[PDB]
Amino acid sequence: GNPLLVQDVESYDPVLNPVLNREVRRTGGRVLITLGDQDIDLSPSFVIF
Amino acid sequence: RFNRYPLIIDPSGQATEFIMNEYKDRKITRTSFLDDAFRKNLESALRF
């Protein structure tokens, strides 16, 4: 749940696509976003720049 | 107050009803050992 600031967008990493698209699963009370193969619980207090 | 995970023996089903009504604030998936959708449920519960 930390703010993230990543510079040098020109070498963009397309692993950030579900994060930017908010492709989120809400199974149960948890909040899930799947990047790559790992499934990561998504905290509400996350921002990226 | 268990340390090792319990094994409830209940022919009547009253213990099952009690534990479902008791741990209802959290999320319970009542699985079974012969259910095909058991390993996935166990892994989800273990992670969550």
Curated annotation (Swiss-Prot), chain A:
It is found in: Cytoplasm, Cytoskeleton. Dynein heavy chains probably consist of an N-terminal stem (which binds cargo and interacts with other dynein components), and the head or motor domain. The motor contains six tandemly-linked AAA domains in the head, which form a ring. A stalk-like structure (formed by two of the coiled coil domains) protrudes between AAA 4 and AAA 5 and terminates in a microtubule-binding site. A seventh domain may also contribute to this ring; it is not clear whether the N-terminus or the C-terminus forms this extra domain. Belongs to the dynein heavy chain family. Homodimer. The cytoplasmic dynein 1 complex consists of two catalytic heavy chains (HCs) and a number of non-catalytic subunits presented by intermediate chains (ICs), light intermediate chains (LICs) and light chains (LCs); the composition seems to vary in respect to the IC, LIC and LC composition. The heavy chain homodimer serves as a scaffold for the probable homodimeric assembly of the respective non-catalytic subunits. The ICs and LICs bind directly to the HC dimer and dynein LCs assemble on the IC dimer. Interacts with DYNC1LI1; DYNC1LI1 and DYNC1LI2 bind mutually exclusive to DYNC1H1. Cytoplasmic dynein 1 acts as a motor for the intracellular retrograde motility of vesicles and organelles along microtubules. Dynein has ATPase activity; the force-producing power stroke is thought to occur on release of ADP. Plays a role in mitotic spindle assembly and metaphase plate congression. It is linked to Charcot-Marie-Tooth disease, axonal, type 2O: An axonal form of Charcot-Marie-Tooth disease, a disorder of the peripheral nervous system, characterized by progressive weakness and atrophy, initially of the peroneal muscles and later of the distal muscles of the arms. Charcot-Marie-Tooth disease is classified in two main groups on the basis of electrophysiologic properties and histopathology: primary peripheral demyelinating neuropathies (designated CMT1 when they are dominantly inherited) and primary peripheral axonal neuropathies (CMT2). This is Cytoplasmic dynein 1 heavy chain 1. It comes from Homo sapiens (Human). The gene is DYNC1H1.
